[PDB]
Amino acid sequence: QLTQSPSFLSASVGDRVTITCRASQGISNYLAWYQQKPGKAPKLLIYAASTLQTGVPSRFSGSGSGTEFTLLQPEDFATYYCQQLNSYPPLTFGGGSRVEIK
Amino acid sequence: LVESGGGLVQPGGSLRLSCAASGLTVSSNYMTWVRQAPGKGLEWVSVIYSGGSTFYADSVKGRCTISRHNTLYLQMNSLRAEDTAVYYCARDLDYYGMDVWGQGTTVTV
Amino acid sequence: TNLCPFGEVFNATRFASVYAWNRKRISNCVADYSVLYNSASFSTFKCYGVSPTKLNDLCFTNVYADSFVIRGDEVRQIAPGQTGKIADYNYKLPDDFTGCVIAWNSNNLDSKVGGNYNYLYRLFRKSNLKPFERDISTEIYQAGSTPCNGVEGFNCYFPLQSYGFQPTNGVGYQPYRVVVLSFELLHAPATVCG
Ligand SMILES: *[C@@H]1O[C@H](CO)[C@@H](O)[C@H](O)[C@H]1NC(C)=O
């Protein structure tokens, strides 16, 4: 399958933004949300829906063949990636919308 | 945490990279190798199981992953144009995702 | 002519999860494999002994059925030599396999409205299973140097993990029922003929 995500987003500080990626046909729990700040190895955010340790202000999920997350704090000038979980031969990533703040 | 390894070399030369564990031993976790081209998204180039079975991608299908004790290895011969990129370690929890990563390291032809 | 019971395997109600696959023995009877083969209502019918016809006329001493449910994209794991979650930590075949595999989609029967969480597989395990082995141990996994002794948490996970069989999923993700009919030939009266 293939995963297609939204384009880049220019947002205002202290505002909750929403990103989305639609899957080809059916995943429904196997998508994880990752954060890559430039120059730094990416950090995960989200399981199917849950959140691991840190992103409490940037946690949201609605996954049925088209998932979407919602994150505000102006330290999010980075890129957001979606990895579909169980496709064992390919571990395909998404188009990876990037967000800038203005 | 983790560790990086060798850097840019010649074309199609014997490319090799290594990794190191920090607080979690490499004998029991789905270790990985993910590649980001400079100016591109992410990829997936290898995964190493707990039992020992290994898996590679379509591209770099001739890559040779390895495991031992806690000095993870990846190797490749046909260091073609796509090999110029950065690579990262990561432990997988196939239902919980690519967990803690290494600092990553870059290589170029 | 007491036909060997197959309607209590393929037409069973509750296939056990892949890590606790239901093993049954067939002996002291005759079975018509050809009628099951020519049913054609089966997604995959792959035989690593001999073709469906010529396996009827070769009498055997035991026939072990092994039934469970797995995911569509991982059906292609059930064969000797394959590797993956199923082929390593839930149900591993031997490279000297005789017998064959019968699998078909059971989307409607086994998928819940929100995805049934009844089924499981051993996602976490140190070493891969030996062929035909079984491992129903439910101890929390020992991920790394430090134990946690029955407190589910970091670096020690409950190895069993479920399936989200939503009734909308991609066909590669909709459940498929699988039964491995493994024949065996010994030094004994062969009581399973055609
Ligand atoms: C299960 O039942 C259906 C209809 O009742 C029949 O067509 C099929 O052959 C049966 N399967 C077995 C293994 O008896």
Numbering used by the authors:
A (entry chain C): 3 to 73, 78 to 108
B (entry chain B): 4 to 72, 76 to 115
C (entry chain A): 333 to 526
Lines from the paper:
In the case of SARS-CoV-2, the spike (S) protein forming a large homotrimeric complex at the viral surface is required for this role. Each RBD at the top of the complex can adopt either open (up) or closed (down) conformation. In this study, we screened SARS-CoV-2 RBD-specific antibodies from RBD-immunized RenMab mice and found that ten antibodies efficiently blocked hACE2 binding. Further, we performed cryo-electron microscopy (Cryo-EM) structure studies of the spike–Fab complex of three representative antibodies.
All three antibodies can bind to all three RBDs in the complex. We compared the structure-defined antibody epitopes with the structure of the RBD–hACE2 complex to determine how many residues in the epitopes lie at the hACE2 interface. Thus, the representative clones from Bin 1/2/3 were studied by Cyro-EM in the antibody-spike complex and the data showed that they all contacted with the residues that mediate RBD-hACE2 binding. The structure data validate our attempt to place three antibodies in the epitope binning. It provides direct evidence that antibody-mediated hACE2 blockade can be achieved by shielding different residues.
